[PDB]
Curated annotation (Swiss-Prot), chains A, B:
Gene name of this polypeptide: PITPNM3
Protein family per UniProt: Belongs to the PtdIns transfer protein family. PI transfer class IIA subfamily.
Known tissue expression: Detected in brain and spleen, and at low levels in ovary.
Top-level taxon of the source organism: Eukaryota
Segments forming domain DDHD: 161-312
Function statement: Catalyzes the transfer of phosphatidylinositol and phosphatidylcholine between membranes (in vitro). Binds calcium ions.
Protein name: Membrane-associated phosphatidylinositol transfer protein 3
Compartments, as annotated in UniProt: Endomembrane system
Organism encoding this protein: Homo sapiens (Human)
Oligomeric form and interacting partners: Interacts with PTK2B via its C-terminus.
Associated disease: Cone-rod dystrophy 5: An inherited retinal dystrophy characterized by retinal pigment deposits visible on fundus examination, predominantly in the macular region, and initial loss of cone photoreceptors followed by rod degeneration. This leads to decreased visual acuity and sensitivity in the central visual field, followed by loss of peripheral vision. Severe loss of vision occurs earlier than in retinitis pigmentosa, due to cone photoreceptors degenerating at a higher rate than rod photoreceptors.
Length: 314, 314
């Protein structure tokens, strides 16, 4: 009945250097660009999806504001008020998410995200495109929004989203570092979703693997290489299944297989490395969080990958 | 009576990438190199100090071991067991001190350092060089040892050192980042010493200013430039006093002057930037913590500076 089969809900929190009140047009511009890539890839190769996948977004609070001010005041190099210096090659970017999630007010940002996402979902259900919706809701979190999205669906084994999450995609999010901090302070939390797919460019300062936090020996298993759309528009035929990694690397892991499988966040691999044009690596450190953030919204590699995953429901 | 007028006690904890049991000969080699620089500068320009300044060291625990393992397992790049990859330009070095001090066992490392320092001090007092000692004890902390040394002398306004600390020198220590984390979680702690001098090379990944944590507008006052011994073996004649910075930058700060002066850690500036040979900047990120760590023990710039400070007691 309903024309929308899959709702892609984007939790847009910006990147680790964003501060203050965001520009709402900037968030909408990101989503418009992403939506145009989705439509183009859909027409070229997934015509059965045309008109059936809808994108909505949720603006998240900029939880790195105070952390940015502290890091900027720690900078040994000369700089102007409210600024970093591009000469600081090793600006401590990894401290920004850690300071952000350590704030006593971080939990309030999570509660706010849940409230805004439920309002967006409810308006969708009343809209013409949402009447009679019975499909899948996938979550997409950007660099910072991914952190909030994860904490919003996590449980042990503030309210809650009004929907059940199927696929959960993370765009260059430093979640791994955050979870390493939380394990250090308080030494299983798992997300309530059908699968986690965490994308990163290896050279992104926020690139953080999650698989070795579930099973440490995965640090010796390479991340999955996402196929370049230009060469493999239909994918490269790889199964993506955890069981294939366990089977191929059985000496490393193998009760072993069942214990790892039980604690995994889905039946597929979690760590996905994206092809990184060499141009992106020619920039000073302070420019990289925005450049990597912006890359996702126009990535045909990422969009084609997402589309392939939502076809087991067709 | 006693031939030793100043005891320089070095808390040697290594750098943020050190793990496991240290090589004791390595720590002793560092201290021997430092001691030889001290003797050479002393003979050239402080002959009244010859034979009257003694160096002792205290090996500290390698509190970054577990953090190193986590960061190494987060690395998106291919690497070997127990290793970082030099291709990871933005390895999250800033996470290492933060994970280290967040461990529930960090407080036990501080207690252990206090115990070992008191044993070293007691053996010194029994030695021929220490009988009748009535002089000053200065503390020197290296990158990691500085963190432990600071927490050992801090109080609000585990045991304690058996001595009172005069000057406290920090060699490229990420204390500022640690204190920014602690202020974020629990939003005055001050060290029990006559003065803090925190040295850094601007390009050192652990370089972190402390002055803006005491007074935020100091982020717009440059750190003090340490004179190069090659050109200014006797110093450049600068007072180093906080009051001179407040006076010269009075519009920024000025009850203001008295409140800032009261919360400062001594009467002198705290942030000291060292000249950095360009060679040190030609190295990949994973090599920099050791290279910067090693630089201090052979630095005539640092040694001449230290010697000038211990002359107000002559």
């Amino acid at each position: 009945s309903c024309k929308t089969h899959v709702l892609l809900l984007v939790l847009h929190g910006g990147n680790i250097l964003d501060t203050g009140a965001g520009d709402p047009s900037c968030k909408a511009a990101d989503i418009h660009t992403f939506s145009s890539v989705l439509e183009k890839v859909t027409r070229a190769h997934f015509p059965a999806a045309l008109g059936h996948i809808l994108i909505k977004f949720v603006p998240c609070p900029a939880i790195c504001s105070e952390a940015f001010s502290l890091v900027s005041h720690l900078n040994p190099y000369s700089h102007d008020e409210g600024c970093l210096s591009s000469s600081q090659d090793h600006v401590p970017l990894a401290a920004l998410p850690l300071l952000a999630i350590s704030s006593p007010q971080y939990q309030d940002a999570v509660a706010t995200v849940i409230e805004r996402a439920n309002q967006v979902y409810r308006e969708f259900l009343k809209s013409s495109d949402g009447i009679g919706f019975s499909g899948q809701v996938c979550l997409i979190g950007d660099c910072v929004g991914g952190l909030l999205a994860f904490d919003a669906i996590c449980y042990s084994a503030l309210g809650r989203f009004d929907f059940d999450v199927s696929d959960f995609f993370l765009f260059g999010s430093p979640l791994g570092l955050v979870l390493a901090m939380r394990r250090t302070v308080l030494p299983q939390v798992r997300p309530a979703c059908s699968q986690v797919y965490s994308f990163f460019h290896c050279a992104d300062p926020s690139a953080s693997r999650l698989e070795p936090l579930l099973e440490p020996k995965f640090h010796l298993v390479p991340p999955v290489s996402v196929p370049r759309y230009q060469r493999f528009p239909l994918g490269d035929g790889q199964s993506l299944l955890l069981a294939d990694a366990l089977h191929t690397h059985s000496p490393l892991f193998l009760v072993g297989a069942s214990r790892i499988t039980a604690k995994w966040w889905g039946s597929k691999r979690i760590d996905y490395a994206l092809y990184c044009p060499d141009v992106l690596t020619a920039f000073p450190t302070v420019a990289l969080p925005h450049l990597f953030h912006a890359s996702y919204w126009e990535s045909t590699d990422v969009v084609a990958f997402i589309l392939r995953q939502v076809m087991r429901y067709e």
